[PDB]
Amino acid sequence: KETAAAKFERQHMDSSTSAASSSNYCNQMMKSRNLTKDRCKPVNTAVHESLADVQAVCSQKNVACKNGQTNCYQSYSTMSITDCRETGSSKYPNCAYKTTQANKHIIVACEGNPYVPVHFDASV
Secondary structure (H helix, E strand, O other), X not given: OOOHHHHHHHHHEOOOOOOOOOOOHHHHHHHHOOOOOOOOXXXXXXXXXXXHHHHHHHHOEEEOXXXXXXXXXXXXXXEEXXXXXXXXXXXXXXXXXXXXXXXXXXXXXXXXXXXXXXEEEEEO
């Protein structure tokens, strides 16, 4: 079983991509990170910053999570991210995604020792 921290890395970390805004970025990313194997994950955000920078957010601004928990943190700086969401023509096993790149703050839920990201709550 994949650890929570490892799952967050696989689903939300893409530090090296040079095509964060390419229309086909999401189709490729979602497939490669195994988010379209048994079904199409409807929504997923990829962060284009170093793992160290994203992990550092767990020590930044403490804010409430959408679900009410208090273990969420908002990055002080804006980060390059890409939102991947299924389009209308998307239909497993033929998943299709719209790619929307943006530069804003990320909010992640953190836990454990080391205290690291385990959930991507939202971006602002």
